[PDB]
């Protein structure tokens, strides 16, 4: 009955409520691994202070909060149920729920872990491609814990760091583009075009290393393959914010030089995200499928559905799980590999952490 | 006896000898396709002239000239000796070469296939990854060159775009990869670093929508998937020239950065090649792992072997002209989606002129 193998899904988390709003972004503001600012302690309040209306707003517009705990929770349970009947041996399992910037923290879920007495942990990102600032950051937050709280852990921990070509992952991927395809008009369909969007990073990112953009790559490859190239596509980013340069081409701006050449049929796909949130309920979905879409002249433009609650997604996280347990892994190669321009000390401290587990 | 079928092998070339730089770099400024500059007619033999004495010299530095024109003709020679006999209906084939800047220039090969009064044409770019500055700019001159002649073409056009996944090309990089690996000492083996260093673009390319960097990312993850990620790796780019943002990180930073985080054993791939050119005999060898590795206290530093040679290579090349005459394709889905932000109105219209190819 007693949790054997605890499974940490890390994601970035989102506010449940426009309450939650000014202390996700506070949280989000006081993180050195995703930016460093002059008095940030001071700064960070504030700045989430001011922002805190505008985000509010975002989120009043697609139904007052964030549905990613929901939606976390249901692909958790639904990969328990499988785990326990695919990893006997390792059963009973018990999925916890680590937001980096909002309850339950990454924290708080590792405090529970260990109350729970595991004997397995399991950090598994909710991002199926690394980035430094996503994976690396709730990685980097679990070494932080165990070294702010003045204690080694008490489970043996290992982690699934990334999966951008997990083929149930390209499969779900695959299966959710083709129904959307289905929705357009017939005499369309071969005519649309594909933009896989997933999220842009700074190009100080980029430049310093950031395997992200490469990964997310390989992602689009695979899907295109199982689909055949049934039709032409682009990799474009989105949530570009600031005055400073973001890798591109811009989704909003690609969607805007689209239409004006000529390509007014477009399927969007969030290829990065594994479920529903701000960036494609209201950037995709509002932002860009309805207004710019409207003030383009766009035919048709859908977005393929999100991940969410597909049971195929469930097994998917399931066979990783399965998978890793079975291979004994502590953590993919590639976390063995920092930047090779990486300036965060704690990056080198981190990767030793999880490939030092013992057992 | 006579040919029926002709492979036009396009690439940008290289001076076979220091004599040969001049043009070279004259022909490469005049591109429009490459690059739009104020009075191109007049600032580009300019701009050859006096970069002439420096780039002369990096090809003493490496022996005199550039092999490129060698290896296509091994490749190429190779290539039809094997579709003779896979492809029986199509032959006799014949291989011509047509590089972008230096002789045989794509219009001169384009000459001879139509006085050789052939059938059937393919354009069979050796860029497996397709940017709109290396193979766009090598169909566009196809395109231009019976727009300018004022003729239509006397043979069935046909080509092959991209080919950034095909298995035998990714199996001939993995094989090479793995015998180099093999020249590390032992001890230092499971400690190496792959570096895949691929030619760069600038920002503004990469943000019009260029597919390039998707493409080399995709042929990355392939290579790692059949070497079953035995080393931990980074995509990085090199050849970045002015002071312009260009896509990064940078190879010869990457290096810097590894050595100065004790990652001292690196392994160089130039994953966007398949012979040997300037870029890899003298950047990567020479100013890379000779200079800057020096500097750098690198304890070991190997570059994979480019493919020349391989009689593998040639069995890829033949299978991919096979498969595409077999599928009576025109040219790849891709082709058929221009750069969301093209502005260069001959893109559609070399587009067109190959998927509205009779027969
Ligand atoms: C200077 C620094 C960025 C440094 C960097 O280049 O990394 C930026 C990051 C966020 C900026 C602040 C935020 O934009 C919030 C405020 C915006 C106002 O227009 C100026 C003050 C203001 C308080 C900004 C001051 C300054 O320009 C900050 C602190
Ligand atoms: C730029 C940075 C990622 C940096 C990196 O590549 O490491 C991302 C991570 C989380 C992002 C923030 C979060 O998404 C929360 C806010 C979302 C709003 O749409 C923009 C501001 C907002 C405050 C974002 C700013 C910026 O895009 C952040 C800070
Ligand atoms: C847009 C927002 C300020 C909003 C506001 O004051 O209204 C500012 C505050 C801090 C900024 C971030 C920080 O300066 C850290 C990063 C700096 C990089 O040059 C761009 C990305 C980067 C992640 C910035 C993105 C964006 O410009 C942020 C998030
Ligand atoms: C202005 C133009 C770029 C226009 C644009 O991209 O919008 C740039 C491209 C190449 C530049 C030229 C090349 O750098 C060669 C010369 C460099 C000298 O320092 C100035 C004159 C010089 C002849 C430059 C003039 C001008 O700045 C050019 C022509
Ligand atoms: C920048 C441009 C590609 C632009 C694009 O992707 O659209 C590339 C194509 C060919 C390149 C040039 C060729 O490789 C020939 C020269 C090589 C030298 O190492 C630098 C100068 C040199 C003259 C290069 C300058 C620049 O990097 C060029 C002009
Ligand atoms: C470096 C070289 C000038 C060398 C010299 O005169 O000493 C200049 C001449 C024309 C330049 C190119 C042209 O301006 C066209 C492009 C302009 C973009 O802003 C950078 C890439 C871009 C492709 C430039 C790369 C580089 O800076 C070039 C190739
Ligand atoms: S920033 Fe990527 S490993 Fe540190
Ligand atoms: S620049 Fe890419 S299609 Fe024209």
Not at 168 to 178: G, K, N, T
Not at 266 to 289: G, K, M, N, R
Request: aromatic share 8%.
């Amino acid at each position: 009955r007693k949790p054997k193998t605890g499974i940490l899904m890390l994601n970035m988390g989102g506010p449940e409520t426009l309450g939650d709003v000014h202390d996700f972004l506070l949280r989000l503001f006081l993180d050195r691994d995703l930016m460093t600012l002059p008095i940030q302690n001071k700064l960070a309040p504030f700045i989430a202070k001011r922002l805190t209306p505008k985000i509010q707003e975002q989120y009043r517009r697609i139904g007052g909060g964030s549905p990613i705990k929901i939606w976390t929770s249901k692909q958790g349970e639904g990969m328990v149920k499988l785990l326990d009947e695919l990893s006997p041996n390792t059963a009973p399992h018990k999925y916890y729920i680590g937001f980096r910037y909002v309850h339950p923290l990454t924290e708080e879920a590792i405090e529970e872990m260990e109350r729970d007495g595991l004997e397995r942990a399991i950090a598994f990102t909710q991002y199926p491609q690394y980035s430094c600032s996503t994976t690396g950051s709730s990685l980097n937050a679990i070494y932080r814990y165990y070294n702010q709280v003045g204690r080694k852990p008490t489970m043996k921990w290992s982690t699934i760091d990334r999966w951008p070509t997990h083929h149930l992952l390209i499969q779900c991927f695959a299966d959710h583009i083709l129904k959307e395809l289905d929705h357009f008009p017939l005499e369309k369909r071969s005519e649309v075009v594909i933009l896989f969007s997933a999220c842009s990073l700074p190009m100080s990112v980029v430049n310093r290393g950031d395997p992200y953009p490469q990964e997310v790559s390989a992602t689009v490859q695979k899907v295109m393959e199982r689909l055949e190239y049934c039709n032409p596509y682009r990799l474009v980013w989105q949530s570009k914010v600031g005055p400073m340069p973001w890798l591109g081409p811009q989704t909003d701006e690609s969607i805007k030089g689209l239409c004006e050449r000529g390509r007014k049929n477009i399927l969007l796909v969030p290829i990065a995200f594994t479920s529903d949130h701000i960036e494609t309920l209201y950037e995709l979905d509002i932002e860009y499928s309805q207004v710019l879409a409207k003030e383009c002249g766009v035919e048709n433009i859908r977005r393929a559905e999100s991940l969410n609650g597909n049971p195929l997604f469930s097994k998917a996280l399931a066979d990783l799980v399965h998978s890793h347990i079975q291979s004994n892994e502590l953590c993919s190669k590639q976390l063995t590999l920092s930047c090779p321009l990486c300036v965060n000390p704690v990056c080198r401290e981190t990767k030793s952490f999880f490939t030092s587990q013992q057992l």
